[PDB]
Design a binder for this molecule. Sequence first.
Ligand SMILES: *[C@@H]1O[C@H](CO)[C@@H](O[C@@H]2O[C@H](CO)[C@@H](O)[C@H](O)[C@H]2NC(C)=O)[C@H](O)[C@H]1NC(C)=O
Ligand SMILES: *[C@@H]1O[C@H](CO)[C@@H](O[C@@H]2O[C@H](CO)[C@@H](O)[C@H](O)[C@H]2NC(C)=O)[C@H](O)[C@H]1NC(C)=O
Ligand SMILES: *[C@@H]1O[C@H](CO)[C@@H](O)[C@H](O)[C@H]1NC(C)=O
Lengths: 100, 329, 50, 134, 99, 39
Amino acid sequence: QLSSNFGAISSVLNDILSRLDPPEAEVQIDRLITGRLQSLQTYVTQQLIRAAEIRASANLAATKMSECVLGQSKRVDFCGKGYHLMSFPQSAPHGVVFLH
Amino acid sequence: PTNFTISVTTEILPVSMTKTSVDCTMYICGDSTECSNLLLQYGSFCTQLNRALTGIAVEQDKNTQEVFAQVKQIYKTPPIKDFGGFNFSQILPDPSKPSKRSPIEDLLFNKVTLICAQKFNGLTVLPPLLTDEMIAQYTSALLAGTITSGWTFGAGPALQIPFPMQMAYRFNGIGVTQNVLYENQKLIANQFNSAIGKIQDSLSSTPSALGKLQDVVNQNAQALNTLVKQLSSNFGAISSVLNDILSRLDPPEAEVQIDRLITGRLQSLQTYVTQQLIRAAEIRASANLAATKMSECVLGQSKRVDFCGKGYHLMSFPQSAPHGVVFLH
Amino acid sequence: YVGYLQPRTFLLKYNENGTITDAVDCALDPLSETKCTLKSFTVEKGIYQT
Amino acid sequence: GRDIADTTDAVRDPQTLEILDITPCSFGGVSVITPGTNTSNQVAVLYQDVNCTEVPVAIHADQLTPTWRVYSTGSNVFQTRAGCLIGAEHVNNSYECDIPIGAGICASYQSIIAYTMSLGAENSVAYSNNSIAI
Amino acid sequence: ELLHAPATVCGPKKSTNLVKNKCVNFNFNGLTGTGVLTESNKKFLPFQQFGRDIADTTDAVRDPQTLEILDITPCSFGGVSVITPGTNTSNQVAVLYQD
Amino acid sequence: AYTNSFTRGVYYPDKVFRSSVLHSTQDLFLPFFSNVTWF
Ligand SMILES: *[C@@H]1O[C@H](CO)[C@@H](O[C@@H]2O[C@H](CO)[C@@H](O)[C@H](O)[C@H]2NC(C)=O)[C@H](O)[C@H]1NC(C)=O
Ligand SMILES: *[C@@H]1O[C@H](CO)[C@@H](O[C@@H]2O[C@H](CO)[C@@H](O)[C@H](O)[C@H]2NC(C)=O)[C@H](O)[C@H]1NC(C)=O
Ligand SMILES: *[C@@H]1O[C@H](CO)[C@@H](O)[C@H](O)[C@H]1NC(C)=O
């Protein structure tokens, strides 16, 4: 998103500063600033929502580690398919893998 | 204590939403090439918006698949029914109708209740993947399986057993001996039948039961209407129709006079998309809760307090509804 | 022989040595348009919008 | 006259007084169905919510080799709820869903075939009042 | 029309000699900038005089008086962090430089 | 007569070095798989 015009005569700050006198360069710089600020805000919002989703997944994983690895579970379809006996953990990049 | 009573209750949860799609250029610039040339200066906002909407769209099918697809075989019900005095007529499919729906599902279907403008400005509605017939088939298969086998078809091959023995075993699961049920069979059966009748009577006479799904429908309609009403605002320009601005002034002034409208409409679209995402999160949470409830109250007996019902849990049955599910405990 | 030119849109494959060893047209068939929109020389399984 | 959402759809004739209705001209999206290019190169195209008796004109029918709606006539024409599908044939079996189209239709590359999905096999369990299984 | 090709008409100015391995601000045919100069093993094509990146920033130059292949990289940046105990307990600090 | 020319005539767009990337250009080119008349 740094290659756009947003209505200004160019996209390089030094190009604008090397051609004109301050008052008009101020207008062009203002347009550029507004556009870039909007882009940054959008990015931050999307990141916040994704973080909430990942947190929900992490809480579920913590509960599953607490209940299946340490003890035998009577809940249907929580730890595996069928009657549960035991489970083992393994480590994967940015996650975890379970054996039922 | 000295005596006992059998009760039945209801529980309602939404699952999915409506799948909509919006086109940027038609909503913003209509069909004017100059506006498109001006818009080409703003980057790739519109691809982002379309990507977000498509991501929202696939999730509803994901949720429905997670909820209603738990078995991989379709089970049938015998044509002869003698369950020791138990009458399941109010929940089983009705073969004398072209829709193949139980009377309770028929009652539920009749209770839940700009079109050109959506068809005008680039708004479309996408159809679902699973029709209502398939969902009804899934529900009937689940009901037949739990009626004929018990909890044994959720952990392997199905095994047959008479219904009174299943009820006695479930009684044994809460701390009451088996000989209690075998000496009070008819009373329990009569209480079951009376409870089912009262459930239908209470459903068919109080309209304040299905408000949760109506709320979601109304929310979506209100959001769409608010979006459509914003195409008649100035935002600072001398008018709101592009053709008048084109026909009144030379291009140099029409440039800024169009820029104002472009900015306003972009802002409106951004707000709409953000609100939709925020709603979709809560819908997904409800769907996950419903899937867990279906797994744990229909295919087995639960010991958690106040999870499946109110009291000591015995068994539960599922039913279909528009964009949701209904449980009887 | 004699050829002719017309306006088109192209996606050019550059390598380290700065040589155009491959280039894909953008209006020939649906697969080329899908490649243009995805910006890659290979497409996986699915249904896309163009 | 106008509508509930500020739109106009009725206009009176200023010479011979009568009412007329205004309907927006057709528009829609174009989708492409491709099996993985590592395995083949055949594709199919879907047009949304249009009768395909009206799609030699929806797109301008000008291309060297058209977008595998080859001057879009010929066989392999199917009308569904989601629109018209060109580039696949209809079968009377049922399999598992490979690529979803919509409203219960799925398409797979064995050429390209379109079918209705099946939910599973059929099982009937014997029920009596004196029988069990162990 | 502004510089979209090798320049032909130029105003009066004083040329200066060429240095390397120090952060400088230069003016190449009216093109202002800042960075450091070094040597690239990759030689440009006979018809190539500019280099860019994804964000449309100038990368490498071929000098208008002598022919070389020199690269531009802005001199180093980074953040600063401060490690301190409670200000109610002491007054010493430690500083960390990132990467 | 007529003769096919499959993939020929692609020329360098501009005079800027680009290293191992994929780029978008809008320029006149010879269409692929064209009939080239022969005299
Ligand atoms: C427990 O309550 C039930 C009612 O829910 C009683 O059932 C009645 O029993 C009498 C005894 O002869 C019958 O005449 C009635 O027809 C039964 N039904 C009703 C609705 O009254 C039952 O008797 C109670 N338990 C005990 C041990 O008395
Ligand atoms: C199971 O219960 C239903 C509910 O009442 C019974 O349905 C009634 O059946 C009688 C006789 O067939 C009819 O006269 C009524 O009109 C029915 N009413 C309703 C609401 O369905 C059904 O008969 C019962 N099953 C059996 C085997 O007796
Ligand atoms: C080449 O000639 C054939 C002969 O009929 C014609 O159909 C085709 O359109 C021409 N152009 C091509 C193949 O690009």
